[PDB]
């Protein structure tokens, strides 16, 4: 039974790694949004 108690934590690691992947995807999305402040075309409309 102790081995099942030990492999449940190896499933918990999979849970937290999927959470880590989702948060990394949000960081990679919002850093791309934040670096491109205004687009190349949002500058064109201010010029217009």
């Amino acid at each position: 039974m102790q081995e099942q108690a030990l492999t449940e934590l190896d499933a918990e690691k999979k849970i937290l790694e999927q959470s880590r992947a989702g948060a990394q995807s949000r960081v990679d999305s919002y850093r791309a949004l934040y670096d491109e402040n205004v687009s190349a075309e949002e500058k064109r409309t201010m010029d217009l």
Partner: protein, 48 residues
């Protein structure tokens, strides 16, 4: 994984039940049980 751990907990509990029944069966089948000392106690009380 946690459900197949608690099913093994149930199997552990069933084998503890079987062991407790084996202990009860051993205390009943053995020679120096309640009945032996009961007959000897009553018989010696009469003789005494």
């Amino acid at each position: 994984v946690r459900r197949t751990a608690t099913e093994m907990q149930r199997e552990h509990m069933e084998i503890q039940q079987a062991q407790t029944q084996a202990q009860l069966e051993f205390l009943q089948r053995k020679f120096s049980n309640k009945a032996l000392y009961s007959w000897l106690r009553g018989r010696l009380a009469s003789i005494y």
